[PDB]
Amino acid sequence: GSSGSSGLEAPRDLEAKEVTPRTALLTWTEPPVRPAGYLLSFHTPGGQTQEILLPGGITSHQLLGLFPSTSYNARLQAMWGQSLLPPVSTSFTTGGLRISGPSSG
Numbered sequence: 027g028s029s030g031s032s033g034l035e036a037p038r039d040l041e042a043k044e045v046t047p048r049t050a051l052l053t054w055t056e057p058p059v060r061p062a063g064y065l066l067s068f069h070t071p072g073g074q075t076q077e078i079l080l081p082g083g084i085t086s087h088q089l090l091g092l093f094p095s096t097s098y099n100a101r102l103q104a105m106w107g108q109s110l111l112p113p114v115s116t117s118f119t120t121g122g123l124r125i126s127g128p129s130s131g
Contacts, residue, residue, distance in 0.1 A: 042118030047094040061104030
């Protein structure tokens with residue numbers, strides 16, 4: 027039979043949280059079968075791409091080296107026995123370098 031799920035599952039509920047012009051946190055729901063590893067790749071709309079080898083065993087990753095008001099496209103792909111389940115691509119925009127009162131009292 028054609029390539030299907032075969033019981034295996036993929037990550038879901040992947041949404042951008044705590045989005046800032048300095049960093050961006052991405053949370054996702056890990057499957058019932060912890061994958062061998064995680065391959066997060068975030069590229070810019072018009073620039074280059076950067077791959078990151080995750081430790082394999084988390085729900086959210088803290089990205090660094092972002093741009094102010096720059097859209098990014100992250101992807102969550104887990105390594106499975108001679109298989110690469112379909113990852114999830116999500117778009118998120120960062121805020122703007124604008125600080126009014128950093129020292130809250």
